[PDB]
Amino acid sequence: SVVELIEIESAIIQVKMQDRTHKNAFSQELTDDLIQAFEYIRQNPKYKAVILTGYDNYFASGGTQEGLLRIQQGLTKFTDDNLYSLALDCEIPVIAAMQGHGIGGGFVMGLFADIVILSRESVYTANFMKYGFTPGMGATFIVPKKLGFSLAQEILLNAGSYRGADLEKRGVPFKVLPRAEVLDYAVELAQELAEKPRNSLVTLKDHLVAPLRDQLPRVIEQELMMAEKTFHHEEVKSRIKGLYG
Amino acid sequence: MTHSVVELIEIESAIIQVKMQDRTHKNAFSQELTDDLIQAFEYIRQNPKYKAVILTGYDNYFASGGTQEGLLRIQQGLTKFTDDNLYSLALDCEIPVIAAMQGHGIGGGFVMGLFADIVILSRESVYTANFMKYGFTPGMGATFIVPKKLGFSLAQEILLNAGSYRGADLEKRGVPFKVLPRAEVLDYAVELAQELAEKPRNSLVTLKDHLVAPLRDQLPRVIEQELMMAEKTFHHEEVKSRIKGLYG
Amino acid sequence: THSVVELIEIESAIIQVKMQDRTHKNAFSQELTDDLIQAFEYIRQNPKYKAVILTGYDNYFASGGTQEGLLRIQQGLTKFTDDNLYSLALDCEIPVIAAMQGHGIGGGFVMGLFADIVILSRESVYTANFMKYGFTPGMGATFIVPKKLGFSLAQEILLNAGSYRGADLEKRGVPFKVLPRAEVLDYAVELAQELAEKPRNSLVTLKDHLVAPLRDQLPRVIEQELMMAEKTFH
Ligand code: NA
């Protein structure tokens, strides 16, 4: 296992991503272990709040270079095995404690969490367009939904990198803390969430995210239409070989 | 007004101030406050000379939300959130309403103020959509107006976790509302009312109709969905225990 | 044609549109109206560019309707009609960066709100000031202001038509980058460079998706704005 599962207190579960070899890029291993961790959480009605973090300086790094090339060649899609919507499909609140870097799909996956916390010193980017890819994995839905239309245009079109400190200065609604405090803060917030009845938490998450769960599939189809027009050029293959990490 | 817990003052010829002054209940929705507030907005409706309304509290309180008895009657299913439509007073008013939140804004109190066209917070005061502390899902259109005014994301946190925030905390979090020291909040709302009053009433009524038409339109359905939520969560014994145990 | 707009090619893939009607302080004269439309047409006919920087001169980004034009409306004489300048950045096929190095007033502020990336100057003044003149807002203000600045700050901006410095907006948490004036255009140039690193067809395809709901919904909002304007001459 490359994802460890740590109960905190009575009803909090910490899904810690730790594929150290790949810096939390979506290796086959990290993919399957995440699916399994969330299926385990789905099957176990004790938990009231999930905390999803990485290890050391990485939250989640996005597609592996091979994984991206497989996408370029059309062997796979960004939406496979639904990694992208794990936190949205989870029935209890999920806090994405992004204590390290969040890159590409790694950032987008965390953005479907109900609560996202950033580290001041780490890097965040929705970097699809750096390779020529129009954004995938619901990025064109969840980036404006969480960060607002205007910041999303810049983030998505330019694919630039931002320190959590830069995003805090642009007015993001996410709590931004020094790396060393992100998990501690997440844990406190998780304990406050765990004070509520599980039924009230699920009933309210259902209702708050109903528009998302309703609209997302149509936004995915739209990204799939964009992807049909942009993903499959030779230039995209060159950008992936030439500019990956 | 009738109960004398709302004070109406004409600040200038076109500016009307609705001061909530239920000292006994700290501007919690007592029967008296409920009655006086409706009578006050109905007076505003019947006198179409004003251009701006300033909604404010007294001292350190803006509005405290349901009384403890009031919350207990809701969980026994004797009454509802909507019921008198207090939540939607500022949205129904045809002229712009400034919620001058000089003091604390709790529960249905906070929410009612967020339905104003302009909201101003006090730095030293406390704001909370605290329904969930008691085990209740939010009512009073909280799940519509809080995302609408503060954005989706900060709404998830405010609503799910029911925390308390000083106006400075919200300010630090990036809200769009002006945040000022308590002692400046009413002065600033008056200066703002005076600027609004530089316009023809008819432009102001016409513009607000256009701007809030999606809210007047969408709100009824969200109220429905929140009632449905209330049916699954409001009526357990543990809500009664949290109300009796965690405050009025 | 009128020389009140200057086009500079920054690199092959970057075009700078510089508003330069010094007599009118970049207010919407006939010359600046024509020239801007002719500049957006030239850009449309030349698919070599990947990014557009729209900017002003000195302390002026764009000043909106002219004193004269507004006065003529206030007393119908006439035509409350729609010139469609406000959407040049929206209809432009490639990303537009509004580098508002100077003041952005009324329809000049709004025109730049329809750009994909907006940059403000701390020192400059910004206002959707339609209602100062007794008018409900036009040119899509009531759509693009909430969309770019959030429902709440838009209610304030459009109802009261107040003036805000860059600095005030930044303290209220706007998502636009805010810089001292002397740094606004250089920062636009760098961002335009980063954008030009992308294949053009990726820029266009994404932009089309991102702004579809704005191109789709805008005409109805314009109809509503013309309605409101009609109801005001009671
Ligand atoms: Na899940």
Residue numbers in the entry:
A (entry chain C): 4 to 248
B (entry chain A): 1 to 248
C (entry chain B): 2 to 235
Sentences from the paper on this structure:
Assays were conducted using WT PksI, along with the point mutants PksI-H230A, PksI-H235A, PksI-K80A, PksI-K232A. Of the four PksI mutants investigated only PksI-H230A was found to be catalytically compromised, with barely detectable activity for 3-methyl glutaconyl-SNAC and significantly impaired activity for 3-methyl glutaconyl-CoA. In tandem with kinetic assays, the crystal structures of PksI-K80A, PksI-K232A and H230A were determined. These data thus imply that the observed kinetic effects are not attributable to global or local structural reorganization within the enzyme as a consequence of the amino acid substitutions made. Crystal structures of the mutants PksI_K80A, PksI K232A and PksI H230A revealed no significant changes in active site architecture beyond side chain identity. We thus propose a His230 dependent mechanism wherein this residue has a dual function both catalyzing decarboxylation and to act as a proton donor to the decarboxylated intermediate 7 to give the reaction product.
In this study we present a structural and functional description of the bacillaene synthase β-branching enzymes PksH and PksI. There is a single active site per PksI monomer, with each active site positioned on the periphery of the trimer, ~ 43 Å from one other. Akin to PksH, PksI adopts a characteristic CS fold, with a ββα core, that comprises two approximately perpendicular -sheets surrounded by -helices.
